[PDB]
């Protein structure tokens, strides 16, 4: 373990002394035994001496098992028996508590390791081996700790405080506990619920979902010193926990009987505080289920303040307790409970980082935590504000030690060598090849040991590397799952967003900067990270930007919703049954929009075609854009904070399907640019409400494509082609010359961004494939699609 | 078995020695016994010798039984008894482990086979039969390997490992384990999630599915040597086995107690790795009911990092774990899981090739293996990417062994002869006919031995067949459920689609080549391997091609969906229906379309008439045409990846239908071909959208009711007549002359292939049946439908 006590380690080192002193190549088990008795006293040492085995008795036998010499101490490590004895003490101390191993455990371990040289020493000297293991044990007392013992107090406390349970106050008198976190005003407010008497029962309302029990340790501390009543001092805090009741009982009826007994013993009352987790479940009122009706005993108890108690209830549970009354509502009284906000997250991270330095890393870093947390709160966005965080910290809190030790020192080849040896050796010895095996053995185990020496030479790489949990590290994780390599995504957002967006330096930079503004807490987070309307036709860069955002902002693309407004416009699905029959605004709110975004909160919510949806739909969209929430689906709250709203329209489309011209002039092109960035955002206003648009940060125009943008759609569709065919069959590349010939056809004055899919289809997909059908190209070769003399020719370069 | 160890086989063979050495012309059981003891000191031999039965006692008895001395042996074979001793020992070696058979088992088997002469030999020589079986048994020698016995001891290690369960590392240190081929890239990403302790726990979320456990065996192996962190210092990996916990307890309370016990012993913490299979089920979160609520012990265990564990959860299950939190989520953490990609598939196949040698019908070929995978991957697809594969290997991996013994040179006839003999013989011995029976036995047993000789002359039919699995072999089998005879289907696709489909050679070749283009992986197959528009009037070639495509691509015709989009109505029936219109488009998206294509993943989806059949449908289909997917049915994704989308049309029909027949045109014909290949596809564009059409592979025109196309429609319908009556037993053939006379009546510029059914009905069905009524033809004679001189005539030729 290397986290043993002295005492163990000492009998063991005494073993080596006898190794050479008695002449043993390998420090035998006989020496570990000698080690115990030669340290004189120590529970092992003493133990052997109890049975009558002094150093005298032992050594006569020991020298009679291996005499002198062998003073060479040939590769002095232990004998394998003796090595087992060391392993044995570790477990012989685990079972007997001890994480740090002593003398005793080794003598106990010897007995265990009973065919060993030691073992035979004792069984030869007339002392039964088990008589020895006994002897160590009966001196391995292992007195109380984490508690104290010296007397007996109390009579009436006996029946009550016994039952049920740990007694939180007790565990907080002598620490065997941790703060852990709060919820500080809750503790004040608990004493608000506890310095009264009619409604003397605290009732914590909130998600549970923060580790309610952390708050509880709060009361303990504060009820003692010094905010507590004048004659309703001498308070005791007694915990009532379900787990103790159910175990070995296995019945609700019996559980009720035991609980009844507990309420009776609480007769030390008028000074007692009871902790009741999930108070509704016991009350039995509300919902189809009652989840037991403890209420018969529990309710009058709650009202009197004999069961002056702390109720841990939730959002719904409080309804289902106050509904009874007036002793579950002439007892109850609620208090507003906290759960971590963004800053709180950071603090939690640090607090339990440090204890996983048992796990030799984690340790570090403030900044790293900040990455886990800060990046998470707004983006990914896959759990809760601190929960998200810790995973990120920890992936990376491992990640680097793995890439560190990606081999031995690169001496991974060594193991490979040693294999080949063993084989040669083995097979050679099985045939013989006598001395032709000789050298093979020697080469084998020589090598083997060398390998192992250098396998811990990247323990130098441990002392070099093995704590990294840094900004970038964490940040890599935050992008990895879906504050450096997420904020490098943020800072370099424009670069990332352009690479899929079909030209449109205009579109990209507008979205990029707006998301980047929010994404480091500069714009507005109680709104989407960016609200936008993206106008244009199909295949212009709209969708492509939505995607590129999912990737950049959250780390991976899968955090992207994409909702058709056409399914529930109540103006294009009204009675056309698009999707399913549900009455359409009800379909969107009551189900689809709210459920989906509630599932993925990070989601780039892409609400397609808000162009001609019913004006009521826009009121909902406006609420998403402003509030960063919608409340629908019978009172569920759906998080649009961390969303990136991108609402598309194809009313810009007309203008955004003209290219960046190739029209009547070449000065029509530089008049198409300005035309697309102006005409679109006003066809937007004509298509739907300004009030809606008033909650939208920037109106992104996705300019139709003139190369620059043409040769970038051709290179997106053709690149989507060349990659989807590599998994099953051929390697395709289109030369730049061939991407050019398609882009000329992606021109139209009136269809500047749509025609491209078909023309990649015909000119790439169809073209390689009709060339496999001829036998010009094939599966599994590299297909360069080239221009021959102004006609495509599929060439091979494999 | 035919795979026995020496010791057995030798004692047995020594019987044959005594057979002739004493003359016993059938090698008796007495000789098997002699066989044991004359083989000296095998466990059988040795055994008898312990009880006192040396060779001396045995042969002395033996020679006093059958004894001397007709040194030959009758067909030198055994007694039936002695043959039984061999069969018995084999089983007496199965019992005692032993895959093969050893000496002991033969003596043990003798005792068992106790009416044998040996048994009586031993019971004559003063040693009880059971004293002999005793001795062999208690010298238990059998086949061995998987050594792990040499004596072991530990103290605390005892409580954990007892319960519950196998140790993955252990089975991989004696290597009774196998890799197994993963799912390799997953394992690195786990050790990041595992060398943690702030979120200590990996939790694998994904399809389970080819064996989740392959990833698990991964960890074990990497955690030993050496790329493993020092974060993960001195780790052991222990696997959860749910089955042992539930067994022998038969109660939830007891089950909980055992799990609790395990969590306690995990006190070896910070040095232990726990593998928890199906981790959600124990947490018991979500649903109407839980799933088992081990959670009380398990949740804090997960949080502490004592149960630093690897969770194997499923698609929904992770939701139901973060649903608890933040210790079932602040410990837990999800990871992206692998299920083998197409290349990985191939490798698996081969990996288990060598054990298919046990059935001897594959090993080999690679080329076939690839087929198993690839052909299946793209074309149905009713299993996962490697499962599909392996099944095909073995499918073919038997197929040829069946052709082996169905047709060798057919010494099946031999056996047939031998039959006739026995009968004759038997009945002859019974008739008497006695010496006339004599020779009949002799002819019988002669035959019997010959029979048996020529069936193992078809061990030459084994050395010929008994391991291959060839290209075609796999491919044909791939066609049987669902490279050669699936890629011959691909290469010869035009030929195959024409052989069932009409004179629309234009259409056939266009579709054939377009599917064959995609289906060989050189044209976009993310979306259907062919999207199409099929123009023509109904019954022309359109439907028929949809069928022929299924047949060619998948090897079965009945993998063809078929939806009419025009049937979806009530899509404007507001108050018109009554007061609400609940249904039809909602049925199509919400259930029918998505479920059906998801059911048969790849299948010719034949979307009938979308000329104006809800303009919204064309958009919905467009998403299929582009992506290969639709998302409907409340979040199901339907893969139309290598479906063949065929969207039908009969709006071009009018021109497609037009003539090419003589008797009335000689210049409209040569204006109907050229007219159809342009004009048809433009009546299409008004009936769809260009946006739709741009994501279509090709726009197919079925030049129809030509001269030519007719007599092929007539030959499909009339051939369906001649075939549909054979089940009810009538043989019909139409001569080409009679199919021609009907074909004249479906052509002009106007009509369709509609009147062809009616006229086939009249001239074949109705007429032949009225010809049974007139008595020229009957039921079950061959009916030739001929033309006499221009007047129809039904002739008979059977």
From Swiss-Prot, chains A, B:
The region called I is annotated at 161-408
Annotated ranges, domain UVR = 415-450
Region of interest called II, as start-end residue ranges on this chain: 469-653
Instruction: Tell me yes or no: is Amino-acid biosynthesis among this UniProt entry's keywords.
Output: no
List each copy of the Clp R domain by range: 1-142
Q: Where is this region: Repeat 2?
A: 78-142
Q: Which GO terms describe its molecular function?
A: ATP binding; ATP hydrolysis activity
Q: Write the record's keywords in alphabetical order, separated by commas.
A: ATP-binding, Chaperone, Competence, Nucleotide-binding, Repeat, Repressor, Transcription, Transcription regulation
Q: Which amino acid positions bind ATP, per UniProt? A: 206-213, 536-543
Which GO BP annotation is one of this protein's? Answer: establishment of competence for transformation
Q: Which InterPro entries match?
A: AAA+_ATPase (IPR003593), ATPase_AAA_core (IPR003959), Clp_ATPase_C (IPR019489), Clp_N_dom_sf (IPR036628), Clp_R_dom (IPR004176), ClpA/B (IPR001270), ClpA/B_CS1 (IPR018368), ClpA/B_CS2 (IPR028299)
Does Transmembrane count among this protein's keywords?
no
Q: Where is this region: Repeat 1?
A: 4-69
Q: What does this protein do?
A: Competence gene repressor; required for cell growth at high temperature. Negative regulator of comK expression. May interact with MecA to negatively regulate comK.
Concerning its family, UniProt says: Belongs to the ClpA/ClpB family. ClpC subfamily.
Q: What is this protein called?
A: Negative regulator of genetic competence ClpC/MecB
Record organism = Bacillus subtilis (strain 168)
